[PDB]
Amino acid sequence: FPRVKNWEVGSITYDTLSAQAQQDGPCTPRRCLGSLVFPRPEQLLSQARDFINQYYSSIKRSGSQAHEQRLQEVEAEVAATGTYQLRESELVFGAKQAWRNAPRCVGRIQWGKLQVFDARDCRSAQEMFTYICNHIKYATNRGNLRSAITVFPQRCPGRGDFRIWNSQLVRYAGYRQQDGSVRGDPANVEITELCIQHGWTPGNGRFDVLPLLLQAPDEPPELFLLPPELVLEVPLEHPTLEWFAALGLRWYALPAVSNMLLEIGGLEFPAAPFSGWYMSTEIGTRNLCDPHRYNILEDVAVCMDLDTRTTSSLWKDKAAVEINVAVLHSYQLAKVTIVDHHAATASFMKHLENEQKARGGCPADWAWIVPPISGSLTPVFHQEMVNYFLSPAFRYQPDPW
Amino acid sequence: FPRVKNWEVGSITYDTLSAQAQQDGPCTPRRCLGSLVFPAPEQLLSQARDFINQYYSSIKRSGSQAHEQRLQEVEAEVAATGTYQLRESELVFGAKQAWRNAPRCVGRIQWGKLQVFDARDCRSAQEMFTYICNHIKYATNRGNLRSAITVFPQRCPGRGDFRIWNSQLVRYAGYRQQDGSVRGDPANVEITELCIQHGWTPGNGRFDVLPLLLQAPDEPPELFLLPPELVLEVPLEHPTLEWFAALGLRWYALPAVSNMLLEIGGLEFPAAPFSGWYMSTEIGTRNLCDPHRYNILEDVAVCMDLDTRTTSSLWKDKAAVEINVAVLHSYQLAKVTIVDHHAATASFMKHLENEQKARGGCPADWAWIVPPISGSLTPVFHQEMVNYFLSPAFRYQPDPW
Ligand code: HEM
Ligand code: HEM
Ligand SMILES: CNCCCc1cc(F)cc(CCc2cc(C)cc(N)n2)c1
Ligand SMILES: CNCCCc1cc(F)cc(CCc2cc(C)cc(N)n2)c1
Ligand SMILES: C[C@H](O)[C@H](O)[C@H]1CNc2nc(N)[nH]c(=O)c2N1
Ligand SMILES: C[C@H](O)[C@H](O)[C@H]1CNc2nc(N)[nH]c(=O)c2N1
Ligand SMILES: [Cl-]
Ligand SMILES: [Cl-]
Ligand SMILES: [Gd]
Ligand SMILES: [Gd]
Ligand SMILES: [Zn+2]
Numbered sequence: 001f002p003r004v005k006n007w008e009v010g011s012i013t014y015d016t017l018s019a020q021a022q023q024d025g026p027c028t029p030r031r032c033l034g035s036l037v038f039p040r041p042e043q044l045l046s047q048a049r050d051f052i053n054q055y056y057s058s059i060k061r062s063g064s065q066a067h068e069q070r071l072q073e074v075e076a077e078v079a080a081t082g083t084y085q086l087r088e089s090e091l092v093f094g095a096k097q098a099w100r101n102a103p104r105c106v107g108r109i110q111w112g113k114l115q116v117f118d119a120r121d122c123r124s125a126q127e128m129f130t131y132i133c134n135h136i137k138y139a140t141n142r143g144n145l146r147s148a149i150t151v152f153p154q155r156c157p158g159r160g161d162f163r164i165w166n167s168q169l170v171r172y173a174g175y176r177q178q179d180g181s182v183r184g185d186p187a188n189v190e191i192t193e194l195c196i197q198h199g200w201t202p203g204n205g206r207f208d209v210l211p212l213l214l215q216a217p218d219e220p221p222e223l224f225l226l227p228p229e230l231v232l233e234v235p236l237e238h239p240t241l242e243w244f245a246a247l248g249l250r251w252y253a254l255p256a257v258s259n260m261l262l263e264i265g266g267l268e269f270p271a272a273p274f275s276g277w278y279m280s281t282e283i284g285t286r287n288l289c290d291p292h293r294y295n296i297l298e299d300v301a302v303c304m305d306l307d308t309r310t311t312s313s314l315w316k317d318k319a320a321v322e323i324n325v326a327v328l329h330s331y332q333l334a335k336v337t338i339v340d341h342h343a344a345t346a347s348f349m350k351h352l353e354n355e356q357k358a359r360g361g362c363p364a365d366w367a368w369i370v371p372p373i374s375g376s377l378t379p380v381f382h383q384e385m386v387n388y389f390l391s392p393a394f395r396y397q398p399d400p401w
Numbered sequence: 402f403p404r405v406k407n408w409e410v411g412s413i414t415y416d417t418l419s420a421q422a423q424q425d426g427p428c429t430p431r432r433c434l435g436s437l438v439f440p441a442p443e444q445l446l447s448q449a450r451d452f453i454n455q456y457y458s459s460i461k462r463s464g465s466q467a468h469e470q471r472l473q474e475v476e477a478e479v480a481a482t483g484t485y486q487l488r489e490s491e492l493v494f495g496a497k498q499a500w501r502n503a504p505r506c507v508g509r510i511q512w513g514k515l516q517v518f519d520a521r522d523c524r525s526a527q528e529m530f531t532y533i534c535n536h537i538k539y540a541t542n543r544g545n546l547r548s549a550i551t552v553f554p555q556r557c558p559g560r561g562d563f564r565i566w567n568s569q570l571v572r573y574a575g576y577r578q579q580d581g582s583v584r585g586d587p588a589n590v591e592i593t594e595l596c597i598q599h600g601w602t603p604g605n606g607r608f609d610v611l612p613l614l615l616q617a618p619d620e621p622p623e624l625f626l627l628p629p630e631l632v633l634e635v636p637l638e639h640p641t642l643e644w645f646a647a648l649g650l651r652w653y654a655l656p657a658v659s660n661m662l663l664e665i666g667g668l669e670f671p672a673a674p675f676s677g678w679y680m681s682t683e684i685g686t687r688n689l690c691d692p693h694r695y696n697i698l699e700d701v702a703v704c705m706d707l708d709t710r711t712t713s714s715l716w717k718d719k720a721a722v723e724i725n726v727a728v729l730h731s732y733q734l735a736k737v738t739i740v741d742h743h744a745a746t747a748s749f750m751k752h753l754e755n756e757q758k759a760r761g762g763c764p765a766d767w768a769w770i771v772p773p774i775s776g777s778l779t780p781v782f783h784q785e786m787v788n789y790f791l792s793p794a795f796r797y798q799p800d801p802w
Pocket of ligand 6: 369786
């Protein structure tokens with residue numbers, strides 16, 4: 001039972017929950033790979049039993065009739081067809097628990113308030129699109145953002161799967177040039193490549209929302225244009241720097257991850273897009289200022305008349321903060337839900353104390369919880385964390401080509 | 402071998418050096434404990450042979466006559482005495498290599514330029530103090546700082562250890578109040594209490610330099626005052642915020658870690674203080690802004706007329722940026738060596754490239770290498786790292802009290 005210390009306060013806890021963390025991570029006694037982004041019939045029943053077990057644990061119903069009754073049919077279902085079907089409340093419980101278990105998510109204080117849209121009765125590429133469009137409309141909710149996951153059907157051996165080919169529902173275009181440089185988002189060129197070679201006529205500039213390459217089992221993907229009315233976007237302005245608006249920056253309202261594999265009770269859902277709301281550093285610091293994304297830092301510094309001829313003027317730092325200020329200001333002005341990295345990390349600390357009492361600890365990935373600016377000014381920086389893998393969970397998966 | 406990616410640029414390396422990791426860390430395939438701050442003759446023999454092989458590799462005479470002679474000599478001296486002695490050139494190489502292997506040091510581009518003072522003939526605490534004064538005088542060098550280490554007698558059987566009780570050579574006192582409060586540096590309350598308990602007449606200021614507590618073998622510690630004129634300090638001012646000077650803030654020139662253990666070829670040196678020069682965030686962000694340290698952030702933000710009622714104004718981020726500006730400005734003005742987090746992380750990137758060429762990898766602790774502000778604005782942020790323990794090495798050791 002690992003001893004965990006907070007270095008700001010001096011408080012100590014023990015992670016007893018770590019004792020039940022199985023699917024091995026990348027670290028060995030001889031080397032730590034904690035900073036790596038991607039770490040390198042009898043079975044389906046084992047992962048199914050334990051999931052059912054914790055479901056009834058939660059609702060005080062272990063030592064029941066319904067417990068072993070539910071235990072009995074799942075094995076019967078796998079005995080007959082080789083897989084099994086989840087009860088809707090199980091699917092809901094599984095969805096929320098997965099979020100609860102995501103080591104890298106700083107927003108988990110909200111894990112209990114999640115809207116699950118059951119799309120398991122899906123059968124083609126146009127029905128998927130309609131589900132996604134319901135999701136986006138509901139989640140966006142005219143700027144009052146609501147967490148949501150849409151679960152598409154469980155993958156089954158033989159015959160293919162549903163996959164959203166975009167990493168998010170809303171992504172901006174990345175266009176190659178006569179040279180190699182990119183107008184738009186350099187993160188999303190692999191997909192912009194495929195959007196055109198499947199037959200989308202490429203737009204003009206830096207902020208073109210991409211079409212959804214949606215794919216139903218076996219038969220290849222098909223493109224879908226998003227309704228401009230559905231895609232809520234926020235123009236970026238600065239509260240006191242009048243020229244910032246002229247930079248012509250925008251970002252979308254809805255962070256919706258569409259390439260991760262949802263795994264519940266040994267069942268694998270290649271298509272299960274979840275969505276919440278942005279932490280402002282995500283947009284302002286990583287999306288806009290990363291050298292390999294929009295890379296705008298220098299441009300804003302020039303506008304602020306900053307001395308870019310010496311690193312020691314801290315011009316990078318100064319311009320980064322103002323970019324973040326603009327993001328917060330613009331989203332608030334547009335009445336779109338957003339949280340600053342101080343509020344967010346403080347809620348995470350609160351989440352940590354909750355999970356300590358409820359579950360005896362919490363899987364947390366330090367490098368991802370600590371925000372990309374002003375890290376030691378937030379309370380999570382001085383908090384040791386234990387990282388490990390619990391089920392149910394979201395996992396990464398291969399790109400469907 | 403572990404594959405490692407730079408996400409800023411797309412680079413890919415493999416850390417083969419990790420395979421020779423002569424020791425084991427806190428992580429298991431079950432759980433990563435990376436974020437945790439604190440993670441006979443036959444084995445003494447194999448440790449020594451390892452280091453001798455290293456030394457004769459470095460001078461390009463592996464497997465030679467002189468090499469096998471030394472091996473035989475060491476095996477012989479461990480037989481007669483249970484220990485052995487380092488040659489001076491072996492000691493210099495071993496001290497550099499210990500710096501080179503230190504996973505949490507961002508300053509390792511410099512590892513080759515280290516001044517090694519051999520104090521292994523030291524015989525008392527009074528002599529110890531003379532050796533330390535010379536170290537401080539040499540390393541400080543009127544503001545033009547030079548990297549150095551002084552090596553005191555090794556751990557030996559039958560005799561106690563030389564120890565410096567102070568965690569650094571220069572520390573400010575931390576006096577408890579009856580607000581429950583601390584006046585001065587809260588990180589130094591315990592060592593301050595020790596000093597008083599050992600006869601020191603305490604001051605009452607916020608920046609009172611502590612006396613040294615030096616322990617000769619099988620002796621109580623002895624108190625020694627540093628001459629005021631040996632301790633170079635830097636009053637802190639801001640280039641455009643003139644009220645900043647009225648805060649009465651100061652910091653010292655010389656960062657000299659004195660409580661770590663140096664291990665070379667199985668031999669242990671419980672007292673071997675080493676010093677470099679500061680990276681500005683150590684002072685600006687950690688020492689002055691940590692809520693459990695000097696904690697000046699709010700008072701600065703208030704003086705800056707920022708809105709400290711709400712977090713989304715990013716008052717914390719703005720106050721901290723200016724505190725770091727003040728530090729950089731002040732040291733440059735005082736002509737005292739200092740490096741900003743941009744230059745330092747940039748040179749560490751070059752170090753990683755050097756080390757991959759030279760040794761096939763580099764032990765590095767992401768969470769300590771990434772600066773405490775502006776993390777993703779530095780190139781180390783997007784660099785995956787492998788953390789592991791190579792010897793020779795600096796290790797933590799328990800406090801002597
Ligand atoms: C409601 C407010 C939410 C906030 C403020 C938030 C914030 C964040 C942030 C900042 C990250 C870091 C990822 C990165 O920077 O690359 C993250 C990751 C993650 N989040 Fe959340 N999130 C929210 C909602 C959700 C929801 C609703 C789910 C699932 C139902 C979720 C699951 C995850 C997962 C699985 C990751 C890991 C991503 C990866 O490995 O690339 N989060 N979250
Ligand atoms: C010359 C310029 C140097 C710079 C800029 C530098 C930079 C740093 C920084 C920023 C840290 C992080 C510690 C913290 O934030 O609390 C660190 C740790 C460390 N440094 Fe360096 N350093 C320098 C010189 C040296 C030298 C000369 C040695 C040894 C010969 C050394 C050995 C170490 C060790 C062992 C640690 C980790 C100590 C711990 O974890 O408590 N450094 N260094
Ligand atoms: C190859 N893909 C690997 C990276 C995946 C990823 C990157 C990223 F910057 C951001 C995300 C999602 C971040 C997120 C997700 C959600 C649901 C809410 C929120 N505020 N933020 C994922
Ligand atoms: C035992 N507790 C673990 C952390 C110890 C520690 C604290 C600290 F403030 C500073 C350091 C070393 C900082 C340092 C050391 C040196 C030699 C140069 C430089 N720029 N910075 C260590
Ligand atoms: C708990 C956490 O690991 C701890 O506070 C670490 C994080 N990273 C750090 N990095 C550096 N350079 N110095 C530090 O003191 C710390 N503190
Ligand atoms: C190398 C490093 O592990 C990698 O760049 C990680 C670090 N932490 C991160 N944290 C978040 N939230 N998002 C990221 O993309 C990264 N990148
Ligand atoms: Cl994003
Ligand atoms: Cl310090
Ligand atoms: Gd102008
Ligand atoms: Gd002024
Ligand atoms: Zn690890």
